[PDB]
Amino acid sequence: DGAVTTSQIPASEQETLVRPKPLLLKLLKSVGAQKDTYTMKEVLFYLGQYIMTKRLYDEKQQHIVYCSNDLLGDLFGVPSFSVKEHRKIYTMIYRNLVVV
Numbered sequence: 001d002g003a004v005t006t007s008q009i010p011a012s013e014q015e016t017l018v019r020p021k022p023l024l025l026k027l028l029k030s031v032g033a034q035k036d037t038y039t040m041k042e043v044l045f046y047l048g049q050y051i052m053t054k055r056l057y058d059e060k061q062q063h064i065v066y067c068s069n070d071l072l073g074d075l076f077g078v079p080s081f082s083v084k085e086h087r088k089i090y091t092m093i094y095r096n097l098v099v100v
């Protein structure tokens with residue numbers, strides 16, 4: 001368990017409670033998550049752990065994640081994305097859960 005936060009998104013939005021649909025829930029459980037209801041910053045921590053463990057960000061100054069051949073690309077619906085465009089990342093995650 002853990003959290004990952006950003007100044008690009010209001011802090012209160014990062015505390016939003018969400019119930020992942022089945023694919024997102026599986027990715028979280030694969031790196032140690034134990035429940036069905038999370039905050040958005042917990043979802044970003046587990047997704048970061050998932051990105052590390054699956055070796056999807058080994059070049060630490062590149063700023064782009066390539067995911068077209070991973071579960072992540074199916075989840076988000078894109079082949080790659082910038083790690084710096086935080087609002088766009090939140091939009092993609094919201095499509096994969098029910099907000100409480």
Ligand SMILES: CC(C)(C)S(=O)(=O)C[C@H](C1CC1)N1C(=O)[C@@](C)(Cc2ccc(C(=O)O)cn2)C[C@H](c2cccc(Cl)c2)[C@H]1c1ccc(Cl)cc1
Pocket residue numbers: 004005006044045047048049051052057065083084085086087089090
């Ligand atoms: C393990 C950590 C080092 C703690 S990490 O920060 O999670 C690493 C993770 C990368 C994808 C693996 N990651 C980043 O590297 C970061 C630092 C990339 C970054 C670099 C520079 C700038 C800037 O100059 O504006 C902005 N963003 C942060 C990114 C992140 C963090 C919180 C929310 C969001 Cl939406 C994104 C954040 C990230 C990006 C996408 C997702 Cl889905 C999850 C986390």
